[PDB]
């Protein structure tokens, strides 16, 4: 009933938030399922992401087992690192590796343009650009709108 053996018994009902004692709620179903010791079949396995401690149901992010080994599990809720693109034109995009605090954050003047590669440091020569919040809104807004007008052009 212990280890990878969180698949053999209702014994690991302690998928309750350890630090707070509250219930680890999965991001998709938005509920925690544990049933009872008299109805262990109603419990649904839950796991916490290794990177950001967001709980997920194994049945919500389709999975067959807890990792417990190999690499650190990552939610489907994090941003990609490799962004393989086909336009074959298999152009690769990788997020620059984290640099020692050599690291630079040169402040924008914001608004449209300012084409960063993909690197960003959200703010209220491997220069991590500092895009704040509203710039993203406007950039997506005009991307999708000017693309729709381009489609109109076609």
């Amino acid at each position: 009933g212990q280890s990878i053996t969180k698949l053999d018994s209702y014994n690991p009902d302690t998928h309750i938030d350890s630090n707070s004692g509250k219930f680890l709620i999965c991001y998709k179903c938005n509920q925690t399922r544990l049933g009872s010791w008299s109805h262990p079949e109603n419990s649904r396995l839950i796991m916490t992401c290794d990177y950001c401690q967001t709980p997920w149901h194994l049945d919500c992010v389709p999975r067959a087992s807890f990792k417990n080994l190999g690499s650190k599990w990552k939610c489907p809720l994090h941003s990609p690192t490799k962004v393989y693109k086909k336009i074959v034109n298999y152009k690769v995009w990788k997020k620059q590796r984290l640099i020692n605090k050599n690291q630079l954050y040169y402040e924008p003047l914001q608004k449209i343009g300012y084409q960063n590669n993909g690197n960003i440091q959200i703010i209220p020569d491997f220069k991590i650009t500092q895009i704040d919040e509203n710039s993203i809104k406007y950039d997506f807004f005009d991307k999708i709108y000017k693309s729709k007008m381009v489609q109109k052009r076609k």
Binding site: S79, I120, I122, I136, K137, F140, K143
Partner: peptide, 30 residues
Amino acid sequence: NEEVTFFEKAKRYIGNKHLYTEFLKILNLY
């Protein structure tokens, strides 16, 4: 109207601010 409501609804449904920042990063890749 709808645009000036989408991100405000998202900042609610996604809750955790860190998840929202990751959402904005994913959006900025696009």
